[model samples]
Target chain A: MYNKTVSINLDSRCNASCDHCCFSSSPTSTTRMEKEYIRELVTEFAKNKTIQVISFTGGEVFLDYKFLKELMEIIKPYEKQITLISNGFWGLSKKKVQEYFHDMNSLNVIALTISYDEYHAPFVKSSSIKNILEHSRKYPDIDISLNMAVTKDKMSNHILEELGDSILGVKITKFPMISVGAAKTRIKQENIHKFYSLEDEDSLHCPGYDIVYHHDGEIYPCCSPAIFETKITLREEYNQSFERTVEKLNSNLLLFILRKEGFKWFLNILKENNKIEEFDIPYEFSSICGVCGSLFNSAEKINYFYPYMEKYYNENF
Target chain B: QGHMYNKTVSINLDSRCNASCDHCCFSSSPTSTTRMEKEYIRELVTEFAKNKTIQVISFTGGEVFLDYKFLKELMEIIKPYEKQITLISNGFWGLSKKKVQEYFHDMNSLNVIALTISYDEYHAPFVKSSSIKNILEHSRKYPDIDISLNMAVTKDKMSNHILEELGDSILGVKITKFPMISVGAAKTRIKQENIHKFYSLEDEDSLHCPGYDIVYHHDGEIYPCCSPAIFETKITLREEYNQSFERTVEKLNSNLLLFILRKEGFKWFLNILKENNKIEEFDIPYEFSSICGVCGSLFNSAEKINYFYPYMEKYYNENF
Candidate 1:
C-alpha cells in the first residue's frame, strides 16, 4: 500500500539510439499504448488518492507530439502532479517549443527531467539544447532538472566548466552510470566501476508500491525500464482493480525482504544458509536495484528467502 | 521564396533602460543611447517571418517598452504573418492606469502571445505597485495573453522574496528566473565566490547553448543567443544583402566550430579524442569553468584546432 507515485511507459518510439539506455529504447521502437486503454488506466489510477505524482516516460515522449498532447489532456483532470522525461532533441527552437508547449503553460506539470550524457550527445544537438534552455527561461513554473550519468573516468569536471556554474533555474543531478543494454556492448571491463559491501543490512526502498501501468491492462510493482521488457513480473488486466495488484505486490516474498531490510540482508542470509551458490548475480549488478533484480531472477534464492518472508508476514499480518 | 527552418529571432531593440540595474547583464543605463533603427528591425522581421519555420519573434532589451511607438509598429508588421510575439519589459511604461490600458490595448491588437515583466531590487526604483496592478488587471481582461515575470539571480544569491512578493500580489502570472551571467554591470556588483562552483564538465555536457538562433543587436550586428560578449567579434549583417535571406543564413552557418558545436557539442569531440587515444596527448585538466572556456583554451591555438579538425570534419561528413 506504499502507493505515493505512479509511472507509465507511453511508447517505445525514440529518436536516438543511445548506448547506455536501460530501457533499450531506440529510433525504431513501434510499441505504443492506444488512447482508449490509457484513458481507462489513468482514470482508475487517479481515483487512488494516495498517488501524488504521475510520470510519463518513453523511448521518447515527444516523438508523437499529437499523442503527447492528447495524453497530457487526459491526465489534466486528475489532482496528481505530472513529470515528463525527455532527451531534449525535439526542443531545439522557440518555434518547436511553442508548437509542443503552447498548452503546457496551462497544464499541471510540476517538473521536467531531461536526460543528457556522452551517450546522448551524438544525437542531441546544441541548437536543440539552446532551445530547451531558452524554453526553460520562457516557462519557469515547471522545475527543470538534468539527469546525467557519471562514468569511471570522472568526466563530470569537463561538463561543469562547459555549462557554467548555475543554469538559472535548472538543477543538475549526477549518478554513476549503470551497465545495462547498450552500455554492456560499449563499455570495456577495465572502465567499469564496481561496488562491494560487507554489511548485509540497511534500509531498502522498493518502487514496487509505485505502480507502473503499461499500454495494455498489465501493471508492474516497479517501473524500472527493465520491467517494461518481456520477462519480469506483471499483474495482467490491472484496470479491473488495482487492489489485487497492490496486494500481490505487498505479499511477494523477495519484494518484502528487499523493502524491509536490504539486498545485503538477502546476501547474508543466503551465505549463512550455504545457498549463495544458487543465486547467480551478474557483475553488471552495480546498483542496489540491479542486485535486487538478480535475486528475484533466481528461484532457488527465492525458495531460500521464503521462510524469512513467511515468518515476517505471519508476525505482522 | 523563403526557406523552411525552425528559428527564434530575438531583437535587442536598444541598449538604454529607464533604470540602471546593478545586475544588468547587458550593462544598460539611462545615459546609454544605442538604438536599433526602425528600418532594420522592420526588414529583419519581414525577412525572418518569410521562413515558415520561424515561430517566435521576441523583443527584449534594456527595456523594449521604452520605445513603445517603435515596438507597436514592429508588432503591426508582424501581425499579418500571425507568429507568436513576446515583449520583455520592466513594466515602467504601464505605471499609470491610462498607460496600462493603452499599452495592453495595443498589445492585444498586435496579437502578442506573452508579456514578460522584469522585477528585482535593481529595478525597484522604476517599479511601482500601481504598474503591476494595472498590468495584472489588463491581463485578467485579455485571457489570451500570458503575463510572466523575469528575475535575475546570481549563483550564490537569489531574489526569491521579490518574486514571492510579486507572486503574492499577482494571482495568475508565472515567474521565469534565470542565472546572471557575469557580464555588464553585474561583473562589478556581484561577488563571484568559488568561481569553480559554477562550472562542471557534466553540466556543460547538458546545459551549453550551441549558438542555435541568430540574435540581431541594435548595433546592426547579428550574434548567437543573447550574450553581449559575442558582439565584440562583430559579425555585422549589412543592409545590402538584406534582399536575399540566404546570404545571411549562409554567413551564419559558415563558422565550422559553431556548426560542429550546434551539431555534436564538446562531448562528441572529447569522445573522438578518447577513441583516437589523443586525450593523453593533451595537457588540459579534467574540469573547466565553462565549455567555451575549455574549448577556447584548448583550441584557441592553431596547432590544437589543426590537430582535431580533420577527425571532426571527416566524422561529421561521413556519418551525418
Candidate 2:
C-alpha cells in the first residue's frame, strides 16, 4: 500500500533544457524508472488504504501516454482522486489536447497543472501558453493550475500578479528558488552569494502541499530532493501503511515539521554561521522548519498519504 | 496626554580641535564656535538642576578645553546642586600634561565623577602610544574620576582590537557602533550594504536588554535605549519627567507597555507564577527588534504560546 503522491518518472528524456530545473529532473538524466515497477506499486496502492491520490509526474508524462492511461485506470477505483502535473507542452496538439479533455472529464480527475514561466518560456513559447489556455478553456470542469519556480533574476510581483489577474482557468503560485536543479545552474554561474529567504511574514498562506516522489519508491517531501540519499525514506516506511502513517502524522514531530514556525530555528543556525541572509528563501524557509523541530519534510509527506486502513474505520464491510 | 518623560537639556560646548584626521565623523576641527554663550549655559544648567532624576548633565564638543571660561561657568552653576556631570571630548586638548592636570583638578573640584574620552582612528589619528600614556597617567592622577574610554566602530574597521588595545590603559571601554545617522559625514556614505556590518548587542549575545537599562535624552525623554533607535517608535519624553519616581514609571508603562509586568522592584515578579495560578499576559514590545538588553528583545519568548495567541485566534478560533 503506497502513498498517493507516487513519483512515476516515466521518462528520463526531457525535450527542452531548463536553466534552473528544481529536481535536476531532465530529459537525459543518468537514471529513469520503469513502467512495470511503477505499475506494481500502483496496484499495491489500489488495494491499500494508505494511498489516497495518485499524481503522475516526470520530464513528460505525455511521452508515455499508453503507460499513464493504463496506470490511471488501474489506480482509479482504489484512490479517491488522480492528478497529473505536467509542462503542458504535450497539450500543444489540438487533437491530443481535446482527447485529454474528454478523458480527464470522464475520469473525474482532480487537476491537471500546466507549468509555464520565464525559464520555460524559451523552450515553450508564450504563444504556446495562449494555445494551452485557449484549449483548456474548452474543458471548464478540470482544475488547471500553474506553478512557476522563480529566481532573483526572474519576474517581479507586478508581472506575476498581472499574469495572475488576467490569466483565467489556471492558478499561479510563485515558487521561491531552491538551489537544486536549474536554479543551481543559474546561481552558480552568476555567483549569487547572498540569497533572500522567506521571513516569518511569508508563511501566512503556505499550507505546504507540494510533494516530490523519488525513484526507488522513496518519497522526498516538498521541492527538495537533497534528502533522498538518507535512511528512513518517508515514502517507504510511512506511506506504505495507512495506520502507521496516521500515527506518525498525529505525533509531535509531524506537526512541528509541517508549519512555518520551524523556520526560525534555521534562521538561528544561519545567525550562528553569520549568514542569516545567505541562502535563498525556499531553502531557508524549508530548511529552517526542520532545525526548529518543525518538519517541512513530514508536512509534505503526510499530505500525500491518504490511508484506508483499520483502527479508526468509518466504513462497515 | 502623550507619552512624556523628563526633559534633559545638554550644555553643548562647541569649540574646534587642534588635530587633523581623515575619517572624522563629527568634523571636529581646530576651530569650532561655541554654540551657546557662557551665560546661557549657566542659565539652562541652573534651571534643569531643579528637576530631580535629571541628576545627570553631559558637556560634549570638539574640545571643551577651548571654551574653558564657558565650561567653568556652567560647572559652577550645577556645582551647588551636587549632581553628577559628564565631560565628553576628543583627547587632543587633554594631550598636554599641564592641561590634563588642570582639567582633572577642575573636573574633581566641580564634582564630575565620570570622564569619557573619545579614542578612535577617525577622531584621534594622532592618538598614538604616547597619547594613551598621557590620558592614563592623568586618570590615575585624578583617581576620583571613573574614567571610561569610548570608541566608535565604523563599517570597514572592527572596533574590538582597538578597544582591547585601549583597554590596557582605560578603566572600561564603551563601544558605539557607527549608526546610519542623518547628520555629520556619516550621511554621505550611508549605504544599505553598510547595514549588514553594523553590530548590535543582539548580534553578540543571545539575551536582550530592555527595562534593565534606560537612557535619558537631552529633551528629558528616558528611552530604554539610545535616541537613534528609539526615535523610530516616536516615544518622547515630555511632562511625565515632572512626575514622581514611581508614578513616572507607572505613567510611562500605562502609555507605552502593552506587555504584562514580569519583574518589579529588583525582584522577580513572575517567579511565583505557579503559586499565583494566573496565566500571564505577554504583549509584544513596541521596540522588541530594535531595543538592546537581556529582557527587552523577548529572546526567550520567541515562538511561545504568547507570540502565537493572536495569530491562532485570527485563523483558527476556540478549537485551537
Candidate 3:
C-alpha cells in the first residue's frame, strides 16, 4: 500500500556536475528553498498518513544542512522512513560521519544510498570507505547501500560482478541517456545501461503523481515539466516562521486531494504532448506482482524470456 | 535470470575417500591426491564470503568425512558464516561407533544439517545397518538437526523392505530419481539389461519439477535446481562469466538438469504427468537413458518410480 515516492530537492546547489543529472540541480544554480519551506513539506507529509517513504535527491545533499536538520526534526516523531540519495562526496571526516549517524538515529530515517563510480570516485577514497564501514557497524540499524550507475553500453560483466561482490547491500541503477543537460554534449553509446522493452514499457503507462514547488513558491508537477514551461510563475510565497510553515501545510486529506487533482492535470499535459497511450489501462493483472528493483526484475523477466508478451532482445538488450 | 541468481559455493575438497563405490562421480578412491589444502579452503571461504550474495558453503567429495582434516577445515571456515554448511557422506565409516559419535558431535557444534547420507545396500557391502543406528543416535544428541535418508532407488537396489526400513528411522526421507549421465563409475554400472530397471515408458507419474528450489555450487555457481537439474555455467564466485537467466538457459540447456520441481500436492502432481506425457522422450541414450538406484541413477527414474505413486488415486474415490 506504499504508493508515493517524493523526491525533495532542498536546494538548487551541488558540488559536482554530472552529465545527465535528473533534477537539473547544479553548483552555480542560484536558487535555495528556505528552512521554512522544508519544515512545511515535512509537516504536510506528517499529516498525510498514506505516504510511506520520503526520499531526498539533489546535486549534493550536504549543501542543505539547515533545511535537512529542520525537516528531520519535524518528521522524526512520525517514525516514517526518510531516505537520501547522493553522490557521496561530502561525508569524509570521522566526527562529521558520527554526527550524521546521530541525526539519522534521532530522525529514525535509516535508508541511506551512496552513489559512486569513476566520476564520483575522486571524492570518496578506499580509506574513507573503510572508515564508513567501521562506524556503520556501530549503528547496525542503518540500512546503507551503494547505488552504482552503469554508464556503459556492452558493460563488462566482470567489472559489474566485482563491484557487486565488494560492496555490502549493493544495488545497481542503470539510467538511459536522455537528450538533456551535459549529456547532450557528452552522450555516447557506452553511456547507455538498460533500455525499455515493449512489455516493461507497459509498466510506466500509469500516470505519475508528483509536485514540485520552486523557491518563489511556484508549483509544478515535476522539475522537468517545470523546466519545459515558457513563463514560470512565482506565487503562494508567504513570510511565515519555520514551525508555522509546517503547521500550515500539514493535512492528509489535502495531499490525497492534491494527488488526484495533479494526476488529472498531468494526464491532460501528456495528452497535449500526444502521449495518451502512456495513461491507458492494461488488460489483465499479473498473477505474480512484479518487484521494481533493477536487478530482481531484470532477472525475473529475463528468466522467463518474457513469454507473456512478445518482444525481442534488440528492443531491450 | 533473476530467479537463477543463487549464492552457494561448493568445493570438492577431498578427491579421496574410503569406499570404491560403483557410480563414483570423481572416481574418488583412498589413493587419490587431488585434495585441496586447508589454508587454501579458508582463503576461498573468506574471499567468497566477501561477496555478500554467497551465503552457502558446502564440502563435497568422494566422501568428505573420510578426511578428518577436510571436515574440520570446512567447519572452521563455515562456522562463522551464518549460511548453512552441509557435508555429503557415503555412510561407510559409521561402523566405528566412537568415530560416529565424534563426527556427529563435530557436526553438531558446527550447526550443520541437511546431512544427505546413503542407505542402499549396494552402496557399501556389509556396510552394516549399525551405521544407520549410529547416525540416528547422533541425531538424538542434536535434536534440532534434521536428518533425511535419501535413497537413490535404482533397479539393482530397489527393495520395498529397505525403503520401509529407511522410512522408519529417518525423520525426513526423500527419493530422488536419477538423471542419465555418461560419467565416472556409472558408465560401467549401467548396461543393456539394467536399462529397463530405470524407466517405464507407459507409467505417467511425475512428482513435478516446477523449479522452486535454487541450487548453489561450492564454487559460487547458482542454478535454478539441484546440480542434476542444470547443465550450463552462468554466474560464478569469480570475476567473469555472469550472464542473464535467459541466456543461461539457452546456452546451458544440455548441461542443466531441466526440471519442474515446484509441482506440489496430489492434484498438481497429476497435472504434471498430463503435461509431461512425453516421459519416453527423455529415454534417449544421450539425455536421461541411464538407470541408477542411488546418486546419479535417481535422476533418470523419478517420474516412473512405482513406489512413489500411491494413495493419489484414492482422492477420486467415492464416499458413501
Q: Which candidate is the best by TM-score?
A: 1
Off by over 4 Å in 1: A1-317, B1-6, B49-53, B155-157, B194-196, B202-204, B207-211, B227-229, B232-243, B253-255, B269-308, B316-320
Query: Each model's TM-score?
Result: 0.50, 0.38, 0.36
Docking class of 1: incorrect
lDDT by residue (A1-317, candidate 1, tens digit) is 75677787787678998877766678776666776777666676777777778888887888877877776776677756888989988876668876665566566788888777677778887557656755664444577876666565543444433443234556555555455667667776455444333342332334345677764445766766444432335475535566666677777676676667656666767678766555655544344455665566545555767787778779877
lDDT of 1 at B54: 72
Classified by CAPRI criteria, candidate 2 counts as incorrect
Instruction: Kindly give the stretch of ten consecutive residues in candidate 2 chain B with the minimal lDDT sum.
Output: B261-270
- For residue B179, model 3's alpha carbon misses the true position, in angstroms, by 32
Across residues B1-320, which tens digit of lDDT does each residue of candidate 1 receive?
A: 54222466788888888888887767788888777777777888887667666788888887888878887888888888888888888888667888888888888888788888877666777787557666765675565687876666554545544543443234445544455554568668877652233344454345344355666776666655565434433234445635345655665666566567667676666666667777657544455333444454445355766776787788769977
Off by over 4 Å in 2: A1-12, A156-166, A188-212, A223-232, A235-261, A266-317, B1-320
Cα lDDT of model 2 by residue, A192-222, tens digit: 2222244543332223433444554554444
After superposition, which runs of candidate 3 have C-alpha atoms over 4 Å from their true positions?
A1-5, A122-130, A153-166, A172-175, A197-317, B1-320
lDDT, each prediction: 0.65, 0.50, 0.48
TM-score of structure candidate 1: 0.50
- Per-residue CA lDDT of model 3 for A263-316, tens digit only, reads 233333444655435333222211111111111112332233233122322343
Candidate number with greatest DockQ: 1
Model 3: per-residue Cα lDDT over B183-291, one tens digit each: 5565676553442232222322322232323333333454444444232222222323443333443333322223212223222433444466632443322223321
lDDT of 2 by residue, B84-152 (tens): 788876676555778777877889899887777766655546656456557765675454676655554
